Each structure stands twice: as C-alpha cells, then as structure tokens.
Motif scaffolding. Sequence first.
Motif, short mmCIF file in Angstrom:
data_model
loop_
_atom_site.label_atom_id
_atom_site.label_comp_id
_atom_site.label_asym_id
_atom_site.label_seq_id
_atom_site.Cartn_x
_atom_site.Cartn_y
_atom_site.Cartn_z
N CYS A 84 0.96 -1.08 0.00
CA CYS A 84 0.00 0.00 0.00
C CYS A 84 1.00 1.13 0.00
O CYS A 84 1.85 1.20 0.89
CB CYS A 84 -0.80 -0.01 1.30
SG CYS A 84 -1.65 1.51 1.75
N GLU A 119 -6.53 -3.37 -5.16
CA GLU A 119 -7.11 -3.11 -3.83
C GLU A 119 -6.16 -3.10 -2.62
O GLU A 119 -4.96 -3.01 -2.76
CB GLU A 119 -8.24 -4.09 -3.54
CG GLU A 119 -9.61 -3.65 -4.02
CD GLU A 119 -10.72 -4.56 -3.50
OE1 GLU A 119 -11.05 -4.49 -2.29
OE2 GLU A 119 -11.24 -5.37 -4.30
N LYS A 133 -8.34 -2.74 0.53
CA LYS A 133 -9.41 -2.13 1.33
C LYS A 133 -8.96 -1.99 2.79
O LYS A 133 -7.98 -2.60 3.20
CB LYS A 133 -10.71 -2.96 1.24
CG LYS A 133 -10.61 -4.34 0.58
CD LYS A 133 -10.05 -5.42 1.53
CE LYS A 133 -8.54 -5.23 1.82
NZ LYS A 133 -7.94 -6.22 2.79
N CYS A 160 -7.75 0.37 3.66
CA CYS A 160 -6.86 1.46 3.33
C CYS A 160 -7.58 1.93 2.07
O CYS A 160 -7.60 3.12 1.74
CB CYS A 160 -5.47 0.92 3.02
SG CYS A 160 -4.11 1.95 3.61
N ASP A 161 -8.22 0.98 1.41
CA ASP A 161 -9.00 1.21 0.20
C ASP A 161 -8.16 1.88 -0.87
O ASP A 161 -7.93 3.09 -0.83
CB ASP A 161 -10.21 2.08 0.52
CG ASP A 161 -11.25 2.03 -0.58
OD1 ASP A 161 -10.89 2.36 -1.73
OD2 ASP A 161 -12.41 1.65 -0.30
N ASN A 162 -7.74 1.10 -1.85
CA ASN A 162 -6.90 1.64 -2.90
C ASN A 162 -7.20 1.18 -4.32
O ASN A 162 -8.31 1.37 -4.82
CB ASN A 162 -5.45 1.33 -2.56
CG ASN A 162 -4.52 2.39 -3.04
OD1 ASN A 162 -4.48 2.71 -4.23
ND2 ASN A 162 -3.76 2.97 -2.12
N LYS A 163 -6.19 0.61 -4.97
CA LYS A 163 -6.25 0.13 -6.35
C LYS A 163 -5.51 1.14 -7.22
O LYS A 163 -5.50 1.03 -8.45
CB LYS A 163 -7.69 0.00 -6.87
CG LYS A 163 -8.48 -1.19 -6.35
CD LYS A 163 -9.91 -1.13 -6.87
CE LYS A 163 -10.63 -2.46 -6.72
NZ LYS A 163 -11.98 -2.43 -7.36
#
Lengths: 177, 112, 97, 171, 270, 551, 107, 84
Positions: free
Chosen positions: C36, C54, C56, C58-61
């Motif tokens: 992340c 992803e 999640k 931290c919720d990303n992508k």
Amino acid sequence: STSTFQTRRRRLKKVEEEENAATLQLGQEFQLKQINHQGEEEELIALNLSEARLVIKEALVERRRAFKRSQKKTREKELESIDVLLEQTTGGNNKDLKNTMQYLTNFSRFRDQETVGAVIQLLKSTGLHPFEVAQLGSLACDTADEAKTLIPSLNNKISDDELERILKELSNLETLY
Amino acid sequence: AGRAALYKEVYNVIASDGSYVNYRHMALLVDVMTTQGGLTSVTRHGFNRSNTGALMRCSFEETVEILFEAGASAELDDCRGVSENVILGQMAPIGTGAFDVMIDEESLVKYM
Amino acid sequence: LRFGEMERDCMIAHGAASFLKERLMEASDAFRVHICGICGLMTVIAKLNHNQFECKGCDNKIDIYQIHIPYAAKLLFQELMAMNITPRLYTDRSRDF
Amino acid sequence: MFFIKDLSLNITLHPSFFGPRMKQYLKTKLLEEVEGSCTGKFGYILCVLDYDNIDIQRGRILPTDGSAEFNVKYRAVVFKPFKGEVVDGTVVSCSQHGFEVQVGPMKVFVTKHLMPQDLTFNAGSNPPSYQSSEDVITIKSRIRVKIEGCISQVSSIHAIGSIKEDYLGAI
Amino acid sequence: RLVKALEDIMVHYDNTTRNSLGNVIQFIYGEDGMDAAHIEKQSLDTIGGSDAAFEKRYRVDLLNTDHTLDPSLLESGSEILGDLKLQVLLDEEYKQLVKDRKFLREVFVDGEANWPLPVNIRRIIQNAQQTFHIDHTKPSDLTIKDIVLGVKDLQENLLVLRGKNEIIQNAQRDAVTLFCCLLRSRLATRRVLQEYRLTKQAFDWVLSNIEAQFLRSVVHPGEMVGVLAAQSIGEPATQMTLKKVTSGVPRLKEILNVAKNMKTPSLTVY
Amino acid sequence: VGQQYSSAPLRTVKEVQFGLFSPEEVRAISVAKIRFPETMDETQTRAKIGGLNDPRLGSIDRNLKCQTCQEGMNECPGHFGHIDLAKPVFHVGFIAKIKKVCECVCMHCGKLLLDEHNELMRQALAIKDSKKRFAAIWTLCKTKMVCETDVPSEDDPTQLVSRGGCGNTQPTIRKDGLKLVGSWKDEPELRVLSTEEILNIFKHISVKDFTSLGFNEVFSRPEWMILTCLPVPPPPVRPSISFNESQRGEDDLTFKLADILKANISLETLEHNGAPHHAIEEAESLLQFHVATYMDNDIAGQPQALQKSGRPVKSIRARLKGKEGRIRGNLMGKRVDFSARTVISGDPNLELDQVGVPKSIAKTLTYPEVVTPYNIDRLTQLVRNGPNEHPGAKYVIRDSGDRIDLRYSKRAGDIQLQYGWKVERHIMDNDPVLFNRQPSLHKMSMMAHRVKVIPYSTFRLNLSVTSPYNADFDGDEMNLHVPQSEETRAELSQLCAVPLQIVSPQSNKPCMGIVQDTLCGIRKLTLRDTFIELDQVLNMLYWVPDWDGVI
Amino acid sequence: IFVYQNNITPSAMKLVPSIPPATIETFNEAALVVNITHHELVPKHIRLSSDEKRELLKRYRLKESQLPRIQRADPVALYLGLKRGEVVKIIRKSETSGRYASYRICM
Amino acid sequence: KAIPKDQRATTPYMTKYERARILGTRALQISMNAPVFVDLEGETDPLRIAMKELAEKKIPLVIRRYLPDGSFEDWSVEELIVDL
DNA sequence: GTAGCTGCTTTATTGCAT
RNA sequence: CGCAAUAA
DNA sequence: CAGCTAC
Ligand SMILES: [Mg+2]
Ligand SMILES: [Zn+2]
Ligand SMILES: [Zn+2]
Ligand SMILES: [Zn+2]
C-alpha cells in the motif's frame, strides 16, 4: 500510471477526499494554485472548448513537423483535415482524441486564434476561478440567469448587467459558421 | 587525553604479541568509542543503544526487544545502514554502491 | 553451502556491493511482494492477471508498488505483525536529511 | 473544464535501445502509454502538448540489468468531468431507461426519471426516441446536460446527468 | 562485536569518516587520508643524528669556500659562489629543514625516525638512478633555484582533501605536513646533488612520480574502513596463544568492555 | 525474481516506519473472521472450514484459490486474519512499559503528574529524544502519587494557581505475572488493575501527553500496547507439514492460536451465560496467558506452557531471537545456491590466483550466459554438447520465462538459440570465483581466483595463497561461490582477485609470500656454494614461462 | 569563579544559576593544584565564535548532532568554561601526519 | 539541490569501485545486446569490451557522487581520470 | 545493598528417537 | 524438532 | 556464571 509535480505527503489515514461539486471544489489535483515544471507556482489552466481545439490542433500539427525533421536522415471541412493530422501523429488506438477533436471541432464557438484571443482577454478581467472563465466561454448564454444558473459558482461574483454585457460581447466575437 | 590512553592500551595489547597493526585501525576504533562523549563500550550496553537505526541495532543481541519498542516509540529507519539493505535485499551504500550511474543521453550521441 | 555473517562482513569490507546483494538474493530468498503506497503493508490483494490491486481498509487500487526483498524478509515482517508491530515499507523518504 | 496539467512518468528502458535515437524512443513510448490513458485523478489524458521540449533528464541505471529509468517530465491536455458541471454533447444510444449523450471523449447518461415527465419514451420509433409537446430527442439531436455524478471505471470515466432543471433541453 | 560496532563506518566522497548518521568520526581517515596498502616504513633523517652531522649534510653556504657546493657537482658551480640572491633561498630552505627538525622531535619525543608513510621516496630515486645511467662523476645542470623551487612545487600538488575554501584548504596542509618533512628531507639541495647525483631530467622525473604515486596512495571514497579496521584488530586477536600486568586476550576484552575493576590497576608516576 | 509479470510499478524500500497496530486496522486488513478453533475438515472431509486456515487466508493443497487472488502457493504472500478477544489483554513485551506509563499519568482523569508548572519537569519536556524524554519524565513523576489540582506558579509560593482537577491518590504499582497491582496509601488498600480499566485510562490520555511520553499520534498510541483485536498470521508463517494425504502436520503456532481461540470462546460463553462474576476473571487470566505466550515464552514467572510432550513451544519472539533465527540467522546470512565445497590440497603448478576445480563440480555449477552474436555459436555448441561432456551446459531459458531442461527435453540435440535467450552453462576455465576458507575473519579470507577445471575431486589452490586463508591440508575443506551476473564477477575480478589482496591494508605489508618447500629451497638454491651445470641451467630456464630465451 | 576549599553548601550552591546573563562557576582548591592542560597526554583545545562554528558547520555540510562531542563537565571543558553549544577545535600531534584538526561541540 | 559542474571537490580520479563498477554495469548492458561504441577488434567478451570502451573513454555513463548530506556531484567516465 | 537480565567463535559431517 | 558425537 | 544496570 503517471505522477504530478505536487508531492502530497501520505500520513497513513487516507480520508479527507471531499467530493467534486462545481462549487469550485475541484479535486485537490486542480486547485487554482498548482505547481509548474519550473517549480514555479502557476494559476490552474482552465481550457474552454474551441480554445482547446486550437491548442490541440497546433501542438498536434507541430508534432507532425518534428515527426519529419527526422525523415531525411469550415466546419465539416475540418472534420477531414483533422482525420488527417490524426492518422499521422496520433496512435489510432487513441480513439478518444479522435472523438475529442470531433466534439471539440464541432461544438467549437470560434475559429480564429485571434477571436479566441480577445475572447480570453475579455472574460479574463473578472477574477473568476478559471473553471468559470472556461464555462462562460464554451457555453452559449442569453440572460445573466442562463449563466448564473448553468455556472452556479458565479452568483455573487458579478452584477447581472456586467455578466450581461460580457454575455453580449460573446454573442458577437462568436465567429459564424 | 583519555583517548590517548585507550588507544595506548589497545596498542600495547596487540604489540606485546609482536604483531603489527597500522594506527588508523586501532585509532578508528579507539575513536568510535571516544567521540560520542566519554567511553562507549563496544557492547550491547554501549554503542548498540545509540540513535542508529532500529533494524540495524536489531541484528545484534537484543533483537526482538529492540524491535518491540521500535514500533512502540514509532521509530523510523533510514535504511542508510549496511545491515538495513542486507535485510531488505537491496544494494548497500558501500563501495560499489556508494554512488549512482547514468546514461547521459548527450554523450550517447556524440559517440558514433 | 552457507554464506553466514562472517562471509558477509568480508564482502562489505571488499565493497563488493552487487555481489553481496546477489548472494543474499538471487542465490537464495528473493521474492516479489506488493505494498500500500500509504500504510507500508503487505495487504495488497494483487491479482496480477486482471491488474486489480485493492487493499481495502486502506482502500486503494491506485497507489501500489511491488518490491524485491528476501522471503526471509516478508517473513520477518509478517511475524512482527502477528506480534502486533507495524513495519512500514515506504518507497520514498520524506524525513529527508 | 478541460485542463492542462503538468505531469511526469517513469519509464524503464532496456539497454537494447541505448542507441543514439534513444531520446526519441523514450518520447515515442511515453506517448504510447500516456495519450489515450484515463485515471480518476487526472481523468482522460488526451494529448501531449509541446512535443519537442519533453524533459528526459539523465536517467539512472537499475543495478541488476542495464534497464535505465528516466523520469519523463511533461505537459498535456486533459478533461475529467465533475458533478454539477454543465456541458452539452451529441446524443448516441437511446432506450426505455433514457438516452446517452457523448460529451467529448466521455459519455454521460440520462435517466427517463432525470428528464421531464411531459417527455415520453416513444417505443415504435425508428430510430428510438423521446417526445415532448414541441420536442423530439434522438441520436444526433444535440442536448445540453448537467453532470449529476461521476464514476471512474477502468480507463473510462462515466456520469449521469439531468435535464430537469431550467435551461437544459435541446438546442 | 568489533564488526557490528563499525560496520557502517566508511570514507565518504568528501574524504571524511562517518556512519549511518553522517556523524563524523574522523575528518580525514586515519588523520592523513591514505590507503593502508600504500605505505612503507620510511625514515625521517631530518630528525635523528647529531646537531653537528645535520648541519654538515643539509647545509649549503654560497658565501664560503668550505661550505659551498663544490663546483664538481653542480654545473653552474663556480658562477654561483657568493651569489647573494641565491643564498637567500639556501638559508630560506635550511631554516625550514630546521623548523622540521624541531617539529619532528616535538611529535616523536622518542626519536624513532622510521614510520609508515605514503610514497616510497627512497626507492623512487634508486629507480631514477639507473634509469638515466647517471654517473657519480660529471656535473649536474640543476640551478640551485631549479631544485629548491621544484620541491616547493611538488608539495602544492599532493592533494589529499581538495576543497575550495579556507577551513578545508587548511586541513590539506594539516593532513600532509608530515609527509612533506620527509620530502624536504630527501630533497635538500645538498643531498640531491651530492648524495644522489641527478640531472635536470632525473629530478623532473623523480618529482613527477612522487606526485602521481602520492595521488594514488590516497584513500578511495567507498572504502568500508570500519569493517576493515574492525577485522585488522580482531584478526591478530585470534592468533594470540597465551611485566605481570593483565595482558593479551583477556586484557583486550577488559578494554573493549570499559570495565570498572580491571584485574591489574597500576599507575606509573615519573 | 518471483515469476509472473506485475503491471504495478517497482521501487525499493527507502524508509521503515515502526508503529503499533490499531484494533481497527487489524479489522481493515483481515480477510478472515476466524471464529472456529479447529483446522478444518468440513466434517472430516479434507479441505478447510471458514474457521481457521483459509477461512479466506492463504491456502495449501497446491490450489490457486485464495479469494480469487489465485497465484497459488508460490506468489501469494500471506493473507492476514484476526480474532476478537472477549476482554483486553496486555502485550507480553509491552507490559514493562504499560506499567511505567501508569506511574506517569493519573487514573480517573488521564493527565500527567507534572505540568510545565513544575520546573524539574520542564527540563525533561525539553530533552528532545523519544527515549530519554520518557526516561526522565518517568524518573520524575513516579514519585508524586497525588494528581493535584493546584500548584505554586512561576511567581510566588503564596499564590497557588490552578490546572486540571481530581487529586485522587495514585497507587504505587508492582508487577505480578501478567497483571499490575498497586497499593493506595491508615493501612494498605491493594487491588488488581483490570486491563479494561488501564485501557481506558490510557485512551483518555492527552494527545500532547502521548507525545511528551515517547509516543506517536498516528503510529504508536499508548492505548495500543493493550491488545483488543488479534492479527492472525496466515499459512506461510505457520505452514503445515502434511504427510501425503490423510495425515496432519500443523505448525507449532497454529496450535497456540488454536489455544488462544478456545480460551477466548470460553470467556464470551460466560459473559452471556451463567456468569459467576469472579469465577470468570479466573478464566480471563487464561486468555492473558496464551496470548502472552503466543508471542513470548521465556518470561521470569516460569510456567512455560509446554505442548503436551514437555516440549516448550516456540513463541514468535523465539523465531527472531539472534543466531539461528530469522534476523541473524536467515537474513544477515543465508544458505546459497551456486556453491560447492570439498578437500583442499596444494599444488605448485597454478599461479597464485588460480584454483583447481574438479570436473565433477564444473558440471554441477553453472553460469547464466545471454545469447549474443559474440557467442551465439560457442553456446549452441555447449547446449548441444549436452550436460555430461565437460565443456557443456545444462539449461537454456527462453524469453518466455520458461526453462528447457537440457538433459531430458526431447529436443536436447536441437535448439536454435535466440538472441536474448539465456543458456546456463558449465563453469569453464577462467570464470572468476569467490573461493574462501572459514572462519572468515580477514578481508583476505575470501578471494577471487581464476577457475581451472581439473581431474580428481579437490580444490587445488596455490601454496603461497594458503597462509591468507589460514589453511593447510590436514583434512581442511573450503567453500567456492560462483558469481552470477556480468556486473557481479566484475566486482570479484576487480576488487577480490587474489593478485590484488597481495598487500595487506592492516599491516601495510604483503600478506602472502613464499613458504615451505619453495622457501627452504630458495635458500639452498641461493648459497655461494651452489652451482649448476648446463643441462639443468637450461631446463630451469625453460620452466620460467616468461623466459626471454636468452641463456 | 569561586575557589572553595573543601566544599560549599547544598543550600549555598542553590543560587548560582539565579542571576543571568552573568554566570558563575565553582572550583575546588585541591582540584586545581596542577593544571591538567599541562599534561603530556592532553592536547590544547580552543573555543569558536558563533561565526567560526557556524562556519566549520557549513563548511563540512554538517548538522549540529553529527559533530563529535565533549562532556559539559569534561576536565578541559570547565577549564575553558564551555556552554551547551559552543565548539572546541582540538589540534594534536599525529604519527600519520604532523597535526590533525578535530572538533568537539559541547553537550 | 544538485551542484554545479563547477565548484565540485571530490577526487578528479575514478574510485577503484567506480571503475570496477562502471565496467561491470556496461559489460552487463553490452551482454544484453546494447550498442557497442568501439571497434570490437575481434573482441567478443563484454567485460573485455567494457575495459576497451572505458580505455577510449567512449562510455556514455555518468557517476553520481553523493555526499554525507544528500547533495551530490556529477562526473562522466569521459571526465574522470583513470589512473589506478 | 539486592535483584534481574542476556550472551556463549565459524562452517561441516554423521549418527541418533518420538 | 531436541540429543550426542566428529572434523578443522 | 560474569559484568552490568534496575529496583
Ligand atoms: Mg588445518
Ligand atoms: Zn493499505
Ligand atoms: Zn492470495
Ligand atoms: Zn487525575
């Protein structure tokens, strides 16, 4: 992906991501205060349709030029003239820029790099946070209301009469077709 | 003057044996101990408790304990240390890697 | 055969950086894990096939780097995590100096 | 609405291409990846302006295999919609659920519910349409919409717009 | 321990000795910035010996028939005798060779004149010797001014720290100083012409090499000194298989520990 | 090196931020609830129950699955899970500090026992150093046990200024096993400090008070040293060892959790059931135990909690503990590939820097060469040469990250090499190699030698290069390491080559020289008394390779 | 400066830091029978102006910490009477090259 | 920051590591079918070529000398004197 | 013044037992 | 997995 | 079992 001259520091907590509303609340990456390559501070660069068609057309062309300095060792009429410059300096798999030049070339409100010149110098004397400036430009308006409504950020940044005059001056410079 | 003695001794030790060592070394060591303030023992009690990184001091004696209070005191590691990269699998800023290399586009055309 | 500490020291003395790193890595562990870009973690539910990334919670992508480190490293960390300690991995320094 | 943002990009080049016409292949590939891209934070990447002055700077060599990493600094033109943003475009497809209007590289969609009621979905129409008392909306008919909400997907941003407020019909 | 105690200590590109914190440990590695490998025991003649003998050897007097360079050595021999403007350098030199005498005897209270020093000025000459088949008979061709000046130049180049300001440049002089004495010792007018007959060529060669060979003997920023020096000590530490004072291995231990109650305490009062 | 192209970018770690897990992040991260204690067996049916082991976490049985994450085994790092404890428990290692902290702040309110109002305290709040600050701080306010409401300011001891209230007395705390107790002092009033209590007092500790006491607002909040949620490491941290099919193999840790879990469930089923109030705190002390052990099992309060078989049980702490353990054991020094070892024996026929490697080994070890129009031939030869004749090769790897096994591949005698292909070949004469003899305590303990393939199984090194290795032939062995990347060898050959190490930078003198025979002989050969006649003075000349051919 | 003979009162001394700018030091008589500076082993040190120091620093691209330190109560330290910040330059002899410039900031 | 091609203090000569490394690095690339800048007078070995590219100072590389503070200097194989 | 704490040279080779 | 040897 | 810090 791609980065941007604007090293925002991530402090673990990824939460503060506002929302996008034409309340001039553009995502951080578009504050009226962004950073230039030279490390300089530079006003957000709002581009209004047709004024864009020129920016693209030009750079898109001048590219074709240096794309050959290395080879020795009318509305619907510009549709065709653009499909050309495209299938020469573009990718072709960039089907968007094809569509963008279509739209951009079509709904354009001008033609001259002179007309679009004064257009800018005109609007550019309000204090309007670049996104407005662009809107008043690429959007055909009559009453100061059509504007103050389709461009809600305005509201108290100008007396109807003024935005009116300015709105009139536009229905003029607005080259024919 | 303390250093002097500290060095003097360390010297007389490797010297009573006949063996010859070049100043610089004992000097360096004798120094490493000396700078900081007074005498810094070459022990878990001394040097390996100073402001160095965590991961580093970690690879010597107190390990887990050291680590535990690393996140406990939200420490931060530069990864400037030899050990650091070794643990990470990166080229350590040492000799070969104490500098960078770059293809200078320019010269790469002047050459042809 | 083993390239224990004793051996290491020597190389570090020689300055044989790349070589040292090479014995430690290619000729041993060497593993590629994801992070992340934010919370320096292993989480990253990477599907290296559909690119999705992803992480999640931290919720990303979007902010995701991949790094090369020893398998005995990913491990060192996971173990510290299981003991509830956050070993953050940041691909760029900020604290400067 | 359309902007000109200053970006960068780090491309890794294989020792192979460490020729003389390298500066070129770097650029050339920059464009292969950037132009036509799409991100939620930059939106639609449309065109790299000023081709001849792209900055490559000195690229460094990644230890383990020549591969050089250059940080191509540059400038290009983009556009990413917003909510509450008003823009007009050519309608495209149309159905019992609404019609979709193409504003630039993007596509905004309107719900049968987001428009006015005195506008019904004409079924037996060819091509399909919606009709007001005095209006007719279909395909190439030009509308002007209000972008209610955006959703950044894959490499294409979408949104839903309404034509219920005032001054938002055909033209 | 000594290992983990000095891992991170290396010479930086500025020529300073630091660790993972940039904490200076030695501004000039080894107080001289030289690579151990490029050093050999030399002897500073300008130090040991009788006051009498010293004068003899290095003294040049162009205002005396018994203390002037016999014209059998220098080519411009006779035409020099008396030359007052030259005797200014000869005295400017001899005065220095003496500041040296006092200087060395002020650092090496002992009198030990053999020390490790970069550039083997001893051999470097011998090579020159039979490289130009110079004969211990014919005259030189070096002006006194040739010699004394070229030496003063040689120095200027033995650049350890490079720097462009005051502080730094100061360090330069510092870091070098000693080597020089040795240099001025083996390159005094007399010695150069009397002891080792050198042509103008021979000299210009010897000078050149001393330099280029010096500049090689510098330390290379990148040398992980700490680890090196670390080993260098705990190496002949293993080769220790063992006046009645705690000595040897346990002794060293005792030290590196900074232990309070050392078995033997002693205290020598003069 | 981990196979499978990743579109994600690629950088190297620059900083390492140490912190503590927030009982919520643990949730955030977790991909498995982890409520069941059992390994799995969906009714003995071999697989896994949504309980422990892949209740989504990584997997076993050589099966892609991993919550679609696929990749299967090699490539899918671990996938963390968690487990909700009934009540708060300490952190076996933080207990030491959680204690020292309470003695610095008051319960009931949660503020320091020394404001900038007290001067000895200020100096402490000035000493910038996360450890020394919290060092002095504690040393100071561990004495005052009255959370005062008014103190004589920086003016007169006649004007008692005000601050925070509640002057309630504070008990001096002492440690007992895994709990903290303190007396409040006519006569003592000793009571057990409940974790739930401490946890709270901490939560209410000032944000700027965190700070003052070596802590961090974002990474290590004192209130975190007490564990609420428990991060459950996935398979690859506590791998199984399944013997074929119908047999177990569960790791040591996998039990400790199993325990921790069970011990937890018991607690909850007592709080929402027959709760004999303080016959429950008699079972809450169990969770504080297992979850103490799971991390550390070498405490002072003896009870080792031996796994049924009197065998200790390796706490996580035990896996990292110096020497033979992760840090000093698997990271500071690993086992390597491309390495050999045998018996060394001298040989007065190899120049210093040479090193004889027995053909047996030249065929075992390899060097990955890249098909270039400079050797596209030499390799095709080796490739087709097979991996048995000496000068040969055993592997050809194509661009398509796939390896051809030169000894079975029904195309052995085939293969057209492709510019860019890699052809692992046999070590050939003159490939630099790192050859050394432990214990490696010199810079010279390891050096680079020119490889010379030779019959008979022994590393045959030159004599003069023997005293730097501290070696001899009374049955001594040595290690040989084969470089791998072009730039690699370069490092050996340019800095490690024996011809270099000739002068020792630890004694500014050569560290190699002539010894034994050649020495004893170069003396007898010297002597005025020694003369040699034609025939010989001739053969002798011939033996010197660089003889100018001038008798 | 105050040369006490055998000692000063723990009540007395508690007023030495109460009147700044001006500062006061205490020295034992017996503790000054011989000058330590004079000792064979000890090299002479020197103070630095907030100029020379800010110079040294900038000239070696150093932060304050990175500099070698000398104890506030160091024998020599009091001889010159330092201050938590001032810098001392120690120039001593060297068996590797005549002199050697070294500095010590004070803690 | 950076540092001007003027004002630099580092040794004008190449560190034994720099050189040692430069060659390696280049060889590596050479070996990966990079462009060859000298006449491979028969030469077919990379690290061999490198030693050659580097002796005619026709290597297109730049050494980035860092300093204990972060600031750095920039030298080119061309510039740097190869004594050793 | 008494109590509590952490480490012990380097690689390798084999037997072993539950 | 812990024990015991044994090499240098 | 030291040798040394912590209580
Ligand atoms: Mg032996
Ligand atoms: Zn994350
Ligand atoms: Zn997975
Ligand atoms: Zn209180």
